[PDB]
Structure formats: structure tokens, C-alpha cells
Design a protein around this ligand. Sequence first.
Ligand SMILES: Nc1ncnc2c1ncn2[C@@H]1O[C@H](COP(=O)(O)O)[C@@H](O)[C@H]1O
Length: 202
Amino acid sequence: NFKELGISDNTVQSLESMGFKEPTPIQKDSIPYALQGIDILGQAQTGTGKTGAFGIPLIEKVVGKQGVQSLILAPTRELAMQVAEQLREFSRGQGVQVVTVFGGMPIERQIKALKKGPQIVVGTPGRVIDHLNRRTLKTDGIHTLILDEADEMMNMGFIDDMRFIMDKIPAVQRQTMLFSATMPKAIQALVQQFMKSPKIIK
Ligand SMILES: Nc1ncnc2c1ncn2[C@@H]1O[C@H](COP(=O)(O)O)[C@@H](O)[C@H]1O
């Protein structure tokens, strides 16, 4: 169960309340490794429980810390919103802020949210780069970087954006996770250059 995987009591209560009675296979396989700080390469698709697989240990990692601690990249506004909603449910009542940054709104609204130093930022690669270029997303405290559906981000033209983000965020103290159903050459290059010999989970 989630307790036996190493998850704290308050987070487990929140998971139970959202209907997570038992971990999924990918959560059982990933979570103990994610908690150990190891880089993870997940070959998984929606339906597996992959949001919980990265999100649950991320909550355990950032709770009680200050400033932007983690960045999750998603291919679409819709997936970003869904991931952010789940993370807010996981972390219910523990003082964790989650901020979403994607296109379609003026960037001023997001800048204001980022000034408060949310522990978790979830965004699309293009919008994230806008904040990096404006210095409104500080990378100095970012200790976890998650690429959700890396193949889909590449299908939408974001490979250079992903490369840039992975190069710009300091790597030595960073834990990186990459989830993707397919791994074409461009994605394999990201793993080889920007990750630390990740554990492969299938
Ligand atoms: N351990 C679990 N028990 C029941 N439902 C879950 C569990 N983990 C994830 N889910 C749900 O599984 C669906 C697929 O999640 P994902 O693969 O993260 O897109 C989502 O609706 C989640 O809420």
C-alpha cells in the first residue's frame, strides 16, 4: 500500500479520499525509486497512474520547502490543468502551492503567481521559456524536473524548448523524470545528455 511505499500519513489520507485505495503497477514500481532521488525513465501512457507515480513522491519532496522547487512540463494546457488539479488534491492541507503556466492568458497574471514562490510549477514548454527569458521563473531552487509525455511534446514542435529547459536548470542537484510511450532518437538524446542513468520502468 502507499504507506509501505514510503508515503507520509497525511498524503496517504488525501489519496484515500480521492479514491486511491491501492497503488497502480507503475506507482508500485516507481515510487520507492523516486523517493530515493533516482532519475526515472517511465515508458507509460495515460491510464497507468503516471501522474501519481511522479506526483505523489514530489509532494513528499517539496512539502515544508520554500521557493520554486519543481517544474513539470506537459504538451497541452489540458494535460497541465489535469496534472495541477491532481497535485493539489494529493497535497491538500499541507501548504503546497501549484501554479500553472500555459498560453492564452496575459503573462502578467502568471508572473504575479510566480513571485510568491510556489513549490510546484506545471506548464507548457513555450510558456515556461517566456518566463525563463523574462527572469520571472527562478531556476536556482529547482531540484525536480518532470517531462510528462515527452513524445507528445516533440510531436508539437517542443524538442528545442525541452533541450533548452533541461540545459538551463542546474543539473547537479536535480532529479529528472521522463515519461513517454515512445522514445525516438530526439528523446533518447535528452536521456543521454540531461539525465543521470535513469532507472527504466515499463
Ligand atoms: N492508485 C489509483 N487508484 C485508482 N485510480 C487511480 C490511481 N492512480 C491513478 N488513478 C486514476 O487513474 C487515471 C489515469 O491516470 P494517469 O495515468 O495519471 O493519466 C486518473 O483518473 C487517475 O485519477
